[PDB]
Amino acid sequence: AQQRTMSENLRRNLAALEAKISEAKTKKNMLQARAKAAKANAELQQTLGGLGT
Amino acid sequence: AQQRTMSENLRRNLAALEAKISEAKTKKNMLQARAKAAKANAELQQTLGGLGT
Numbered sequence: 001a002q003q004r005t006m007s008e009n010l011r012r013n014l015a016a017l018e019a020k021i022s023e024a025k026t027k028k029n030m031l032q033a034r035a036k037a038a039k040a041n042a043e044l045q046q047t048l049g050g051l052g053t
Numbered sequence: 054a055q056q057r058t059m060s061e062n063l064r065r066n067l068a069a070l071e072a073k074i075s076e077a078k079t080k081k082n083m084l085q086a087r088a089k090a091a092k093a094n095a096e097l098q099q100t101l102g103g104l105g106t
Contacts, residue, residue: 006090013097020101 003086003090006087006094010090010093010097013094013101017097017101
């Protein structure tokens with residue numbers, strides 16, 4: 001009875017953790033896209049601008 | 054008469070000791086199961102938690 005109770009706690013706590021990890025995989029994929037974009041947006045502005053001589 | 058009296062004391066005291074030992078064998082078997090379980094329960098929580106940087 002104690003074992004069956006513990007196994008459920010392990011089974012469903014692991015599932016919650018695996019969900020978070022799973023979020024991290026998807027989050028990394030979209031975060032990567034914007035990480036590229038941000039540098040580009042500044043590039044054009046740095047080239048266009050009158051910054052420095 | 055003294056021998057027969059002593060032999061009973063030896064026979065039945067040994068039986069009580071062997072019972073305790075026998076308990077220890079069974080107790081070790083179930084204690085081993087929970088010893089594994091306890092570390093696992095903490096593992097998931099340690100990974101999930103915001104403990105440390």
